[PDB]
Design a protein around this ligand. Structure first.
Ligand code: TYD
Ligand code: BGC
Lengths: 7, 391
């Protein structure tokens, strides 16, 4: 909900 | 010249950064890195100094209950962690290149701002360039971030001198983020004109395949590759199974990758082989084709490898989301894209049969030579220019 990744 | 390279994401988010740093010090420049503990071995392996920051990205390298660093729950702890450890590293630097987790990206841009050194954010896929986002999508992200960590940032910001900031989506990604991807695979689109594309950042791997793998790749027919990189979803295992089955239905051997999902073979069979850390570049040039996830790094490596591909769409290709790379490979005619999360054995057997067919086993061998091999150099020179101009 507003930060990124990827995991 | 000395450059700091930051990042926090899957391995596909990190390898490119490690390549840039390796290339920089190879050209005489100096490069330090700030990445999660996950990549210490890899960095020491490549000979690039690195500082471990924050939590581990891969589950299998953390306590049963410590959520991932991208987890909202622990965002404040993140912003805090970087502002704490980056300093010792960014000191003495002339430029910063970062990617991944926005919270940290912003924290890093901040410290580059206090020093007066240029900062650059890079995306690995076109569809992530804010120019490909809807003017609507923008504000949404901005709000989201500004909401989630907007404060913890400014706090630490005010804690070193600089004043507050908003719309962190635009801040951390910058007005003109970089696109570190190859033109043939990841072409730009009108929406993104004056956008810098350097080509993908690849580190020419020289690691030799183990004696065992070398043996296997001798005790039989030329095998197919099956792997899902950083993919850790529970389906990953099912997908691998179906793939293994499909390749076995074709009457071909298999070389599987444990990856982040920790896959395993299902038979003591001599027609298979599991590998941990391996030189993919080296392996792709010794397999019939590769079955894998919709990912940037693997798709490109197999493309410069010149072998056909079968890419597993994360989900059904709908009007609101399409597997970029998977589709791209299909459109380029170098492979087949199959829907997932768990493709049918039929789809994979068919896809596999299509792929190893002359038409594709050719467009692939040909497209292989249109791939840019100087992405890391272009980024380095673009860095040299930055430092010279704005600093
Ligand atoms: C699994 C694996 C990957 N790689 C590297 C090469 C790729 O360019 C890089 C990143 O893969 P990539 O598919 O881009 O991303 P993701 O983490 O989402 O799967 O990983 C190796 O060098 N050895 C390995 O054993
Ligand atoms: C951020 O990533 C999501 C995830 O797949 C994508 O849908 C957005 O467009 C991108 O900005």
């Amino acid at each position: 909900x507003x930060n990124x990744x990827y995991x | 010249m000395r450059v700091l390279i930051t990042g926090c994401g899957s391995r596909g988010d990190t390898e490119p950064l490690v390549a840039l740093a390796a290339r920089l010090r190879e050209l005489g420049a100096d490069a330090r890195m700030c990445l999660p503990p996950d990549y210490v071995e890899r960095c020491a392996e490549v000979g690039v100094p690195m500082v471990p920051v924050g939590r581990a990205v891969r589950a299998g390298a953390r306590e049963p209950g410590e959520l991932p660093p991208g987890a909202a729950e622990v965002v404040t702890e993140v912003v805090a962690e970087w502002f704490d450890k980056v300093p010792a590293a960014i000191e003495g630097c002339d430029a910063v290149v970062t990617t991944g987790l926005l919270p940290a990206a912003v924290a890093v841009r901040s410290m580059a701002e206090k020093l007066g050194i240029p900062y650059r954010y890079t995306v690995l896929s076109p569809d992530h360039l804010p120019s490909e986002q809807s003017q609507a999508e923008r504000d949404m992200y901005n709000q989201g971030a500004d909401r989630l960590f907007g404060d913890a940032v400014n706090s630490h910001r005010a804690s070193i001198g600089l004043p507050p900031v908003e719309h962190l989506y635009d801040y951390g990604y910058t007005d003109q983020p970089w696109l570190a991807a190859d033109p043939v695979l990841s072409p730009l689109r009108p929406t993104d004109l004056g956008t810098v594309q350097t080509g993908a950042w690849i580190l020419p791997d020289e690691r030799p395949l183990s004696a065992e793998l070398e043996a296997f790749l001798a005790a039989g027919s030329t095998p197919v590759y099956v792997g899902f990189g950083s993919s850790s979803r529970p389906a990953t295992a099912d997908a691998a199974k179906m793939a293994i089955k499909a390749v076995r239905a074709s009457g071909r051997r298999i070389v599987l990758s444990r990856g982040w999902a920790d896959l395993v073979l299902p038979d003591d069979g001599a027609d298979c082989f599991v590998v941990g850390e391996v030189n993919l570049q080296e392996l792709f040039g010794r397999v019939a084709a590769a079955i894998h996830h919709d990912s940037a790094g693997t798709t490109l490596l197999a493309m410069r490898a010149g072998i056909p591909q079968i890419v597993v769409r994360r989900v059904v290709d709908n009007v609101v989301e399409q597997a970029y790379h998977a589709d791209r490979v299909a459109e380029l005619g170098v492979g087949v894209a199959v829907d997932g999360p768990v493709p049918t054995i039929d789809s994979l057997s068919a896809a596999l049969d299509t792929a190893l067919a002359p038409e594709i086993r050719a467009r692939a061998t040909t497209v292989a030579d249109t791939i840019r091999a100087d992405g890391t150099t272009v980024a380095a020179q673009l860095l040299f220019d930055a430092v010279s101009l704005e600093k």
